[PDB]
Each structure stands twice: as C-alpha cells, then as structure tokens.
C-alpha cells in the first residue's frame, strides 16, 4: 500500500463545566502517534507511539505552538458558530475537523482531505480538487465566502501537496517495522450450545494489524451473509485489533460450516472449522 495520515480535532464548549477544550490526535493509518489536549496544566503536543519519540525538540516545540494557535482559533470558531446559528451562550457545542493525505506505494499523493463538522453534522468541506468548497448550510456558506475571499484553499492545498506527504513518508520510515509490516491474525473457532437443537460457532481473529479484515461464514461453500453476527472491529490496546463472526447452526451439523479469514498479513486466505 498505500497509506494515509489524518489529524482529528475536537473543540468543545461546556459553559459552567469547564473552559473550552481542544483535543487533537494524529494517526498514520490505524496507529495514533501524537496528541494535544488543552486541559493539561501545561499543554504540549506529545508522542503516543514509540517510533515518533526520538523526533527532536524542534518538532515538539513547533507542533506545540501550532496546536496552541489552533486551540485559540477554534474557541473563537465556537463563538462565531453561536452567532451564525443564533444559539444561546448557555449551551454546549462541538466543532470537529479531520484532514490529511493519502499516498500510494511510491509515496506520492493520491488524495487530500479537509472536512469540518458542527454538532455532529457536516459543516464545510474542501473538495477533491483541493481548490473549492462544499458548504452544507447557510452558515457554512458565510464561512465559504470568507475562505474564498482569503484564498484559504490555496494554503491548504500547499500543505497537503507538500508537508503532509513529506512527513507521512518520514513517519512511514520511522515506524516501518510496525506500520508497514502487517501482523496476521491469530485465529480460532469456538463452540457454544444454545439449546438442545441449536448451537453457536464463533470465528475469532486476534492481534492483527492493520484493522481492515474480512471474516465470513460459509455453509457448504455458500456465504451465510444473512445469518452472520459481525461484531465491530475493536482495539486490543496494544496497537493491534480484534474481531469475531458468529453463526447459529443446528446441532450436529457443525462440520458443514467453514470460517474464511482475509487479511493483508495473510499470504492466502484462511479456512477454519470447529471440532
């Protein structure tokens, strides 16, 4: 692959409960590597993955200044949004931002992203051409007129084509043996009676990275896509992931059921069965 870098900002007001708060997290693919939280006594951008820790003091200082400025900007954006939507200053509101870049195997830019939301709904987004906006409502149309008047999209495009790609390449290098070496799932099937006439077969995949994976149940080679319980892929807490797929089968017919596992760490797809 084929990788991505993303930053996620959450700016929240909470009158009477706290000062407005800004939290930022940075991801390379499914791995978080930095964080900033304005509530800390002395807020700093901080490492959240080992492969970024040996990055120099210039990096942390620069990123800390940038985050402090961004926090200021988003507190003001919360006030502005209050005016745009004619809302009271007593309520709690949230602005969210996600942005970043996708690159191909050759490290070159594939796509840039920059999207904003207000109270969990689309607010305004940079288009794929990285030179125009889509505004979701009239408030956002105000923002759009400002940003067009200020040539904001040019500056963002410059970031996404330049720094975003260069740094993603650098991080992919820094963390190569975790970020670019898929960890295949450890797999197994468990069996649990439900009644005297039915039972559950559960196919497990554990300790895999990246998060993308496909678990399917087949019955004599035909997908049970209608009768499969699929749990959301979940973090294990050690920068690997977990998932399972379950199917209810009639008792004594377990042997006719097969679990199929697909993941990039696997050379060829796996087919497991219970005993």
């Amino acid at each position: 692959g084929s990788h991505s870098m993303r930053y996620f900002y959450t700016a929240m007001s909470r009158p009477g409960r706290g000062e407005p708060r800004f939290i930022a997290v940075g991801y390379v693919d499914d791995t978080q590597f930095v964080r900033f939280d304005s509530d800390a006594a002395s807020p700093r951008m901080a490492p959240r993955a080992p492969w970024i820790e040996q990055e120099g003091p210039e990096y942390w200082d620069g990123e800390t200044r940038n985050m402090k400025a961004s926090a200021q900007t988003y507190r003001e954006n919360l006030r502005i949004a209050l005016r745009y939507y004619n809302q009271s200053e007593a309520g709690s509101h949230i602005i969210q931002v996600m942005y970043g870049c996708d690159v191909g195997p050759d490290g070159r830019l594939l796509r840039g992203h920059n999207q904003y939301a207000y109270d969990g709904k689309d607010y305004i987004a940079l288009n794929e051409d990285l030179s125009s906006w889509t505004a979701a409502d009239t408030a956002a149309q105000i923002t759009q007129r400002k940003w067009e008047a200020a040539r904001v999209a040019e500056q963002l495009r410059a970031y996404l084509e330049g720094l975003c790609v260069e740094w993603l390449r650098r991080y992919l290098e820094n963390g190569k043996e975790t970020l670019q070496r898929a960890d295949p799932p450890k797999t197994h099937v468990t069996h649990h009676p439900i009644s005297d006439h039915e039972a559950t077969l559960r196919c497990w995949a554990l300790g895999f990275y990246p998060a993308e994976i496909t678990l399917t149940w087949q019955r004599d080679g035909e997908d049970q896509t209608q009768d499969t319980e699929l749990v959301e892929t979940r973090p294990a807490g050690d920068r690997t992931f977990q998932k399972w797929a379950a199917v209810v089968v009639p008792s004594g017919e377990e042997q006719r059921y097969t679990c199929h596992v697909q993941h990039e760490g696997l050379p060829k797809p796996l087919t497991l069965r219970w005993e």
Binding site: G18, Q72, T73, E76, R79, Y84, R145, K146, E148, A149
Partner: protein, 288 residues
C-alpha cells in the same frame, strides 16, 4: 477539584449581576465559598450554597478572589479540595481612564498594536478587557510620568480572536478588585487578508456647489457589507453590499450636501462578523 466559574462575566459593573457556579462530580449543588485572605474561613458564616450563587445587584462587597469547595460526604473533611480561583472585579468605582490605539484601531492581520491606557488619577494598576462573555482581563502596573499614570498593553500578532471592543480600567492600591468606570470603548478591527475592494467616485472626485458625489465600493469577492471611512473626523458609515449583473458586490455611499471632502477608504466585511474587515481599498481624495 471543582470548576468554579462566573456568569456571564467576572468583570461586572456595580448594580449589574453575576453568578458563581461550582461544578463538582457532575453537579452544581452543595458548595461553600472562600476568599483568598481567609482561605479556610467559609464566607457568610459557612453558608452552604444549594444552587449557583447569584450576586444581584452587584456591590463592591462582592469584589474579591473566590474559591469553592464541593460537598464530599465520605472524606477526612466533608468537602473537596479547593477549586480554581475566580477573581470577581467590580467596576464603576473611580473616574474612567482614557484608552487609545497606536498607531491606530485598524490593525493589519498578523501585526501588533499598542493599546495605551492613561489617567491623571494615580492608579496602581491598569486592566485591559475585551468585551464578551467569559473573557479574562490583562493587568499591568501603572507607570508614572509628569503627573499621569499609564500603561502600554501590547496586542498581537493580530487575529480575529483579538479583535473586538476594548475597555480599560484603573485600580488603586488598597482596593485591587475594585475597578474604575470603564474608558470610552475602542473598536479594534483586524484587516485582511480578504482582498481589498475598489473605491470610485461618481461622477467623479471633483465637486463644488451644489453637486452630488457618490462613492462606490466594489469587489468580486462576496462581501455582505461595506464600510466607508474618511481620514479623521467623520464617523464610520456602512451599507449592505448588492450583487450586480457582472457579479460584483457593490455599495453606493451618497455624500453631501455638507461634506467638505477628504481622503476616503472602504472595507468589505461579512455577516455576523463586525470586527474583521478586508484589506483597505486604495485611498480616494475627494475635493470640494
């Protein structure tokens, strides 16, 4: 420790109103208040506020440095650790100081401006406060020069978060939480980077009599409003922008019959954002 806050503002005039809230364990109930001096003597004879404490109308007695402790049943003391400190400053207690901007109130984005507060009264401290809800004032010590006391507040690098209406206050030695009346307000506007509009005169800039002159501000950027400003004197005037057939947004400012001309500039701005303007247009000298 609880979160103590003042609503709508810790800087509050006499006769106004302010509410202290103590948020602790997802609750606004059951807290006591302390002033900084007697940091273990709960005020009002150890009164337990069942709800948020409403000071109204505000008096000079309300001024001070507060912390709160929330109810904590099972603990060595029946109460929490001290909250964050909130300073209630009560204004309107002395003659107002004066506030001016150097070099001016229109500040280019990214640049710095000096807001000078001064008075003939010997204020020990000056406070600069941007008007708005939950804003923290800046404090400086009053310098003394030839019988006037003064302080220079540096504001910048300029951005929208620093733009707005500012007032400055003085305080005297023994009542640090009591502020003067506010200075006359100063509107600090950030300009740019929004592209400058074009300013023209119709039928032209040379007028005597008897003759009508109209100043048009125009831009292909979608400003909602235009501001016409004359160098010195005459106050700021503003009009809605109207989109024309050629997709320019334009406003026409008719002058006269008085106006003795001068050097004019115009600015664009957007709805619900009165303190951020475009770059200034080229100057236009109007001659009567």
């Amino acid at each position: 420790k609880p979160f103590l806050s003042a609503w709508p503002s810790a800087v509050v005039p006499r006769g106004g109103h302010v509410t202290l809230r103590c948020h602790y364990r997802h609750r606004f109930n059951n807290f006591m208040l302390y002033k900084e001096d007697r940091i273990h003597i709960p005020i009002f004879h150890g009164r337990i506020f069942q709800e948020s404490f409403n000071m109204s109308p505000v008096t000079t007695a309300h001024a001070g440095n507060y912390t709160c402790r929330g109810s904590h049943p099972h603990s060595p003391t029946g109460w929490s650790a001290p909250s964050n400190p909130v300073v209630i400053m009560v204004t309107g207690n002395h003659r107002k100081p004066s506030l001016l901007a150097h070099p001016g109130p229109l500040v280019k984005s990214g640049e710095r401006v000096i807001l000078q507060c001064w008075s003939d009264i010997m204020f020990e401290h000056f406070f600069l406060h941007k008007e708005g809800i939950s804003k923290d004032p800046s404090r400086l010590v009053g310098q003394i020069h030839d019988g006037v006391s003064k302080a220079n507040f540096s504001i910048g690098p300029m951005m929208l978060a620093l733009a707005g209406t500012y007032r400055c206050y003085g305080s005297v030695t023994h009542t640090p939480y009591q502020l003067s009346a506010p200075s006359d307000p100063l509107d600090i506007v950030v300009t740019g980077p929004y592209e400058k509009p074009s300013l023209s005169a119709q039928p032209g800039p040379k007028v005597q009599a008897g003759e009508s002159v109209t100043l048009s501000c125009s831009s292909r950027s979608s400003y909602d409003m235009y501001h016409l400003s004359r160098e010195g004197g005459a106050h700021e005037r503003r009009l809605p922008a109207v989109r024309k057939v050629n997709r320019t947004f334009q406003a026409d400012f008719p002058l006269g019959p008085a106006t003795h001309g001068g050097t004019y500039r115009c600015f664009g701005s957007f709805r619900h954002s009165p303190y951020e303007w475009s770059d200034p247009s080229d100057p236009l000298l109007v001659s009567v």
